[PDB]
């Protein structure tokens, strides 16, 4: 099958330049153009440009005036995009896409790369539990992190029904916070183990947190 694999998320200080990769497989790397598509909250999909790998040919979206330098490497099956000088207008998700078999439509899409442009420093998240009491509900609070994004899952992927991972919220502090919660029968909260897996690559953090019933020492039993 056809696949495009993008580089991880990034933090760059304004006026520096990011170079982001797209690894193409399952097709003749030189038959198809590689298209680069931008997306900010609010502004939806805008086209940045394209490269036909190793024919020297590449097209700049007028808007960008030489800033979006589209290169490629035909025996690495990897196309690139460098963004020349950075403002926060660049803070977006960037995609690569390959056009169709016989048709000028973006038929295959990268997974996306979040670039954040800010002078602010990287911070890993503090992960705190959200402990059930009393269909019970539990989760984790992925607090005080920067930049976006973080991933969250449960039982290393094994648990997905009733999972709600919320949008991140920017805090007064200039740091982000989000919650992931899962609902589960409370007749399992004895020895059905629950762990939220929090990965935030910009700070190279990984946290595997057990959310436990904080059943205290004041009461009685169940």
């Amino acid at each position: 099958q056809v696949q495009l694999q993008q580089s991880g998320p990034e933090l760059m200080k304004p006026g520096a330049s990011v170079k982001i990769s797209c690894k193409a497989t399952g097709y003749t790397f030189s038959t198809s153009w590689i298209e680069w598509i931008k997306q900010r909250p609010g502004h939806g999909l805008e086209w940045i440009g394209e490269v036909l790998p190793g024919s020297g040919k590449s097209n700049h979206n007028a808007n960008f005036k030489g800033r979006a330098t589209f290169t490629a490497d035909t025996a690495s099956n990897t196309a690139y995009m460098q963004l020349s000088s950075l403002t926060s207008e660049d803070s977006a998700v960037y995609y690569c896409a390959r056009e169709g078999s016989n048709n000028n439509a973006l038929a295959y899409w990268g997974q996306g790369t979040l670039v954040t442009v800010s002078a602010a420093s990287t911070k890993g998240p503090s992960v705190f539990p959200l402990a059930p009491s009393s269909t019970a509900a539990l989760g984790c609070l992925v607090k005080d992190y920067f930049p976006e994004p973080v991933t969250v899952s449960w039982n290393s992927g094994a648990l997905t029904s009733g999972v709600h991972t919320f949008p991140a919220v920017l805090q007064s502090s200039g740091l982000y916070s989000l919650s992931s919660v899962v609902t589960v029968p409370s007749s399992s909260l004895g020895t059905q183990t629950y762990i939220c897996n929090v990965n935030h690559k910009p700070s190279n953090t990984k946290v595997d947190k057990k959310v436990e019933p904080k059943s205290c020492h004041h009461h009685h039993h169940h």
Partner: protein
């Protein structure tokens, strides 16, 4: 420039309902592509060359049009069709439409409310976080109020909401009240009060700082 204009920017349909969005060019155009997007994932290409259904797309979908107006159409809306859909043509600039957020309307669901007191480990670091979950509800709008003892709280909480679930089509909301160790331990009762169309009577959830 040829400018693509999409209508209606936001719309809602019940199951079985026939829906018809519209992408209009400020000039003439010979084809229209459509891509479907659900929050936080790559747009899937959906309908290409005006009418041709991309692999894997249900046949209840159909596209068409000509020259100055092209459209997207679902013969009978279904849960999994609720998404944002962008029209797109290469002679046009900007190249893409601004999209149409198609939502699925359905029978009302009252939110389950859960409250969470700050965790032990968090407290021993500086601040506090009391989280309130309004879970699995229809529609989006809900009122949440934080009641610390007597008082009501203003300018010290934040909200976040999921997109429409694919299964049931319900939302889910979370409120975080942030108040330091000091002011956390300077108080006793922590309440979360919830209003909703499905809620005939408000729902309150609470706990006392040192209690079980």
């Amino acid at each position: 420039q040829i400018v693509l204009t999409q209508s209606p920017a936001i719309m809602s349909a019940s199951p079985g309902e026939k829906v018809t969005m519209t992408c209009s060019a400020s000039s003439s155009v010979s084809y229209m592509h459509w891509y479907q997007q659900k929050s936080g994932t790559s747009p899937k290409r959906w309908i290409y060359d005006s009418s041709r259904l991309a692999s894997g797309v249900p046949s209840r979908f159909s596209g068409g049009g000509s020259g100055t107006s092209y459209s997207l159409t679902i013969s009978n809306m279904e849960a999994e069709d609720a998404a944002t859909y962008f029209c797109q043509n290469w002679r046009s600039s900007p190249t893409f439409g601004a999209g149409t957020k198609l939502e699925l309307k359905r029978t009302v669901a009252a939110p389950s409310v859960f409250i969470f007191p700050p965790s032990d480990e968090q407290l021993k670091s500086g601040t506090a976080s009391v989280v309130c979950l309004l879970n699995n509800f229809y529609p989006r709008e809900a009122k949440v109020q934080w009641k610390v003892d007597n008082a009501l709280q203003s300018g010290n909480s934040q909200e976040s909401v999921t997109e429409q679930d694919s299964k049931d089509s319900t939302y889910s909301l979370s409120s975080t009240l942030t108040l330091s160790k000091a002011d956390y331990e300077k108080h006793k009762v922590y309440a979360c009060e919830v209003t909703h169309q499905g809620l005939s009577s408000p729902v309150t959830k609470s706990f006392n700082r040192g209690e079980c």
